[PDB]
Amino acid sequence: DISFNAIPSDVRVPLTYIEFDNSNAVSGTPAPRQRVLMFGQSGSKASA
């Protein structure tokens, strides 16, 4: 038996049921996005 999600085992309506499963979809791993954080100072009249 295939482990289903959102397809109850207690269904008896004869209409077909198709399911889209997001697991086992991405192969490899996505490249991380660069995140850089700088601890600077702000002078006077700075609006931040």
Add this chain to the structure above:
Amino acid sequence: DISFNAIPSDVRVPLTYIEFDNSNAVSGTPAPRQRVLMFGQSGSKASAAPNVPVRIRSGSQASAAFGQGSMLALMADAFLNANRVAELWCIPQGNGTGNAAVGEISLSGTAGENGSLVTYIAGQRLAVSVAAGATGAALADLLVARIKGQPDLPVTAEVRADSGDDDTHADVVLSAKFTGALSAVDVRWNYYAGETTPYGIITAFKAASGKNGNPDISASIAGMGDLQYKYIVMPYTDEPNLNLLRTELQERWGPVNQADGFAVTVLSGTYGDISTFGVSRNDHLISCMGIAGAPEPSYLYAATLCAVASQALSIDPARPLQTLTLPGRMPPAVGDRFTWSERNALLFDGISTFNVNDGGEMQIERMITMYRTNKYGDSDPSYLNVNTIATLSYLRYSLRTRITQKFPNYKLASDGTRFATGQAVVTPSVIKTELLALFEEWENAGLVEDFDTFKEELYVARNKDDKDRLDVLCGPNLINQFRIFAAQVQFIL
């Protein structure tokens, strides 16, 4: 030789006689229909009599049958929007002692921002168009008219005169359609993002103090019936109701009644109260989710959680409820959510947790039963996972069906008996092989992991004292759910 059912033995008439028997006519187990019973409260119309179970099928029918803006109307509406396939039953609880007021909303100030004011009463957005130079009395009147224009709210409203020096000031008194400990609702404002209240309003909510007692579920649990009622929704949290339902389920979950029931609850409050409750109850047949500062009332979260839990468990009893989400439920605001340490501490205490993933979606995290202490103190992990009790219930259901169908009217005997091929005889060895084959039958579909240790530890014997019962002792060998991944890298360079 063969024991033929309903065929007259000792007959002479020459003909052909053919009979159909249901013994050995079912493979695996039939799919158990999921059934959910809620112990909610009803008022106003309340056409259905209190303490009477009603098979409700739609939100409109619930509103017309349990009164508009009642606890059960909202709870059934929330459930049916999450799990339509399940069979639902509602039992009204009449009225609870206490007071019929929630609080007051103070709305003072004049505004000049041609914007809108949004109030999240019980999580249902109420938007009022605030115009330039609008006194607070106009906003109060428009807000109360809007509240009366949305009967789905569990709270009615009436505008009250200021009776004070401030002319613009005006308040909206709130009454609850049902009187109980769950009557209080959050009247927060400026939830979500991208919208701001106008400049010239001072908004406050003075919640009237009180301890309205929940109605007693005394005849309600006596009027349930005999249906299995796999999962039960309890909005109440006071000790008497939970103790009474604990007795009810323990009678059901006993080895003779053979009915299985699980209670799902949600507690809104602070972290300390949740910890105290989880330490207090100490029961393996109830599970609670703790929420701090829920904009919506607790019973809605309980209903949706029970719906998704019933779905996940009926589809696969041993599948962990880690990534399941509660659809359409408003999460607590940021800065009022338990961190990782708080969630771990709560999971230790016994109250289940939940994760608020990105996108304003509330997940399930770990549903755990409120069982932490063995009989003589100690600490027993044999019932932590709700998957454990659910799979135990499913296993008992399947084996009861198999034994009651495959071996009716048989005649057991000692192992060395010379029974014929078709004769209805079940020696301990025959039952042992049948149980092993059935164990494989629910091993192909998971839920029992190991098999060898089950075979060695399986012990089917004839009762030496008295007769006509097989003493069967089997290690459960329940499967476990992939919950925590621990990995040490130990790079070698």
